[model samples]
Target: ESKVVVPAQGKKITLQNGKLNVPENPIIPYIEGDGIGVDVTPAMLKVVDAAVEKAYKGERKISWMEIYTGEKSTQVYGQDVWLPAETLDLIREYRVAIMGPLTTPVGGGIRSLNVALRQELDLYICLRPVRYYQGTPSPVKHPELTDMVIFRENSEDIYAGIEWKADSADAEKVIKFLREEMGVKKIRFPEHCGIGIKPCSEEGTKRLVRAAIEYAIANDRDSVTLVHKGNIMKFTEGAFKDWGYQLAREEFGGELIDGGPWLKVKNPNTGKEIVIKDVIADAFLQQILLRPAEYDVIACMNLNGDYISDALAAQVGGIGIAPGANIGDECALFEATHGTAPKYAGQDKVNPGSIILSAEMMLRHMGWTEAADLIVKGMEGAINAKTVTYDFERLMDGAKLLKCSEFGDAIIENM
Candidate 1:
């Protein structure tokens, strides 16, 4: 284990075993993400710093320290396999971090580092906020219908990362048992298909839902909707819905007081109230279109979260503008939801909106509301002025096209 000590204005921050340590009021840490991560991360940090500088006038600041992982980690750790233990330790110690995209080498060799981090850290909540930026390009005629914060159960559902290749012997055994012993009728399998196993647990589901409820309550959100396909996957998804309600009842009994016949009670801590409600996963999908205004916050499993977040993003614009956060109580990591456009990686032609917006979430989480607001306002101004990238320019007939760093500059300039 190694360490780096960063001396700030009023504090001495230490980076030991790849983690950065700062005080409660001013949280600091390392961000070693992947791929386009290199381009977007610095942009995000710069924008956040600019916003903070403008908002607080040097009275307050975020001290960011770099921590390495992924390809960079391999250069230092002698292995490119999965996440190094040192990086995980640093994240655990710091309690919060913002990251860029990490390349997931696909094949039989290694799984996704992002997935591994979620599983290893038990980061149960994947929060994604999808909304419309004034001039962002969108397929839908009305993109404004997509403004919602999704709280996906990070550690459970299909994302639990359990699976076997369909052609493998293990898959054959499971298929045979389900067909013969369980008297199953239809079991479809492709000869070369890979199988994925989803293990959504009650504990996992409850924790995620609780986090969403707590977020909604703290942020003064109107409601928190429990989305699940319980009708089909009763034991797993159904139990998720049930456990979610249990958490809402136990934690936010009094605050969520006015939904249905569900029980209610007062919170001894804040004295505020909230209510609990459920929505079938399938119908929930439709409601995203039919009644977009009703949902303030959503809590579902990983697969559902992925689908819902992308769908909502499409309704608003595209994944390019969607910002996501993989969070645990101790440490939260922010990232851009879109992938690395290998074609445009070095060209610097891609949009940096997603990463920049994600940095906004990071600032807000750190209680730097003024800085966060400035970033948002700057982004809105940039978009409204049609100073966007190729993606938005092509989608938007009259929108002005800006490069990656140019958009970053736009945001800072507006700020």
Candidate 2:
């Protein structure tokens, strides 16, 4: 018994032994989120529905189930219930969900609805694939060369939320313990210092690396690069690089390249060589711009991932149009990689590309490759035709500006 109204015509998606079981008419949960979600969500739905219908031609469909979160959840459930229990349960039960951008709760309790959802589900992998859309505006001369998939560790590192306030008793107690028992003299300003715990366990590092390697092999990628600041932080980031290589050798039969640190593994499916390499975080950042095509897949810690994902997204002119996913073994949540623009709430005026492409990712995840390809074709066709939203219209020459809904229609028409 819950407030959600399940769609009678569709079947719930299930998971068996960490593999998703999607139905012909799978019911997917979605959160409309706050502010611009009102505009982008429906546009995404329309474009997705169009693609699915065209691809299957009455053979399949999606039964969308609406779940509440952020500002909308409080109104539907109770006043203080931003993230309801049933919402999480519904996503878990369904196994795959997509969402628009959500606003962070101002009154606290849950700092960020998006982060809360990811942590609650134990979604340890923050998956971001960056590539250029044809004819889109860009700052780089060769934006098309910037194609990379980032697998960011989502569970630990600085994101573990183990911090004590400065000048508080808890902070002082931990500081004193560090100085006395640990015999640490690194604290230059111990009197009013804040303390944060960075925990990078072997279990967390190995699991994240395992997923990245699996994805590379599965997708026929050329290489998997472990990006970390291992030189400075030997125990945590350095251990991440070491554990990644060790796992590649232990599980994936990776062999050292030549006589050195870099390794090469044969992809079981493609039988092609997949390089396993590492680079310091700063060098990796510079290399992305100078030698963008050398890297294909990246695995890094939480903080480095956060910075690198956005940087890569910007290179391909897809900061606002990028799609993102938080995935674990069981459930996967796809989302728009932007924020809720409250100022343009109901204006019908922003790009819905992010959520729409997120649905494309969701489709491919469900093994509906034809439908996903259609989405990519539609998006590329729409952009190439120069019928775009304000964001691109202002940047390009001889481009017809369309509103949020109109751009979605253009995509559908192109399809």
Candidate 3:
């Protein structure tokens, strides 16, 4: 049983009757990511452990099981094996995990290790809750107005890794087929182009949208907006918009107010109406910056969701503190939304807020509200006190800078 893991035996967190069953001591696996991962990952673990202990008074505990991935995976396993089957198996079995930023290798070697893990695990929903922490410095005048949960479709679209290089034989073959076989002649420079196929199925669109809407209902969110560039990419992106509204009507008990597309459904708990609206991707970007609070829960395609979530993260603060999760019905993997800052590896320079907040989400996901609340309190206290990492220190007034490790300790101190 401890073939890959250290001889750590604790109860495994699980899903029962579609709800979480967290034992007093649950063995949660972790992938210490690449580069700055080593710096912030430990920070996250310490903060999470502190919150759990403080909240539970030693009655509850987290038995952290160290697993391997990224560069660490190479050291533990072998070279060129960035991801292992065993790692995926445990993340599936354990049902909940917390991780730091992983490097997505650029310029062609392996596809993103992050993408492989999520797709292999069937984690179809990428959940990012971007909200203000009071003192977090931002580019916007009223960062407080930016409070929204983004439900990004994790599985489909161009992220599927289906692209051919410019002027490659495959690209030429596909382009010829688009013109000759499929009658797609919109290619401006057909011979000198790279091509990628986008696949957005009805099942994929509805499932992601359904999850977003259900979340809005459960969380008492005002509306769930579907953002897409349907005007240009009609069939796939437009179908996302069209199919999303249709799903709300079919399954969610949504109805049109005065005329047609804009729909509303009565919240089963609050009895207030939860609006369902669609906005074009381009205008949605502008509008979110101008008027963000109007949108609560966001449901969008894989690409649009990716762009929107990060943009929204920037408005509130930045991706440095953007905590995220890739979730399905059974398994939920929490992670920092920012990339691995390889230059700052082991420097304790980058912010650990994202990974810490990710652990906060993990704690909440496991039904540990007290510990989760302490995490939020710790974060808010740290930011409000201006005991921040380098990223926020430069931007905020009267800020006292702390290293990644110190920031973790500061959060613990506040808690």
Candidate 4:
């Protein structure tokens, strides 16, 4: 059995693995993030544990081990920083983890730890599932229509970490090089404009699309939509759509269908077969608003997915109850898609549905379907009864307001 220590507020958690006999349950690693993480994380853990306990009875249990990063890690290690080698090592070894919102260190010195983790681990696919819980309050008339999975290329596009502040000398160098070397005459840059480089490679685009196709096939989804603003950013976003369709045709032959009136079949030299199609990013966004039911799965570049996912989440309901996962070939991490609401820290008033639902995703990843199902059913039950948190209560007329911990208890009790 392996042993590890995690520093928590006013307490330290020592984790041991002798408690669980199941292989997958023996070592589950996690990172409790900054700010309100102290409240939300424990609430999430409790709900997950309750679901597992009730589902398996005495047969299985998850042996959770907490790893550190972000502000909590900085406080423990005496360095305000990004990811620690130790934390990455733990996640690499475990192959699966769940984390809360990590505080991004402000200023030029440190990049976001969340972004660094995705790049470092090569977590190429960021999956954000936007679905309406039965009892959740939504601004849209058809809340259920918001159910769609967003598969964002996590490591590429504008988020490739290439950018220059307009005032910096680097920005001037880039501008001069572009004009002189690339023969660009019409270079328009405002004096204070921050220059950001968007690099979307063919290889990067293909892999993310490949993952999306695989997910659609695995999950039995109808179609996989390639979302890109190709009309304007041809080489970058345009190439993304082309490469995405290429990968689909080459890798997932005969399993996919295009949205047009008639289907087209392309057999690439890779010898694999698939049905391929494309959609402009802006039009795709409009469709999500006007005709959401038609879309099943979406694979988009970094910026498009970031914008699309959040907007869809907001349309269905706020992100308070949404869950997301970052996945690679072998590694996966589930997390709450919402922010760390510092104002509600320790108040037990904010909703914990996002984190709890993310834990449900983690359970499903571990093949604990029974436990995951129980959590879903429990949540649905609570929501149907109108026993929800403030986020939902305000939007839902006559809904019973439940505190964060109490909502968790409601799930457990219903389970």
lDDT of 4 by residue, 276-383 (tens): 456788787788889988887788999898888778888877877888899876577888787677777778887788888899988887778899999999888888
TM-scores vs. true structure, each candidate: 0.86, 0.95, 0.97, 0.89
**Model 2 weakest lDDT span, ten residues long:** 104-113
**Weakest lDDT window of 10 consecutive positions for candidate 4:** 6-15
lDDT of 1 by residue, 243-262 (tens): 88777766665333455534
**Superposed Cα deviation of residue 375, candidate 4 (Å):** 0.6
Worst 10 residues of 1 by lDDT: 4-13
Ranking according to TM-score, highest score first = 3, 2, 4, 1
Please identify model 1 stretches exceeding 4 Å from their true place: 1-27, 172-195, 254-275
Q: How accurate is candidate 1 locally (lDDT)?
A: 0.75
Error of 4 at 406 (Å): 1.6
Q: On residues 273-328, what C-alpha lDDT tens digit does candidate 3 reach at each position? A: 99999999999999999998898999998889889978999998898889999998
Better of 1 and 3 by TM-score: 3
Q: Which RMSD does model 2 reach against the true structure?
A: 1.8
Clashes of each: 11, 0, 0, 2
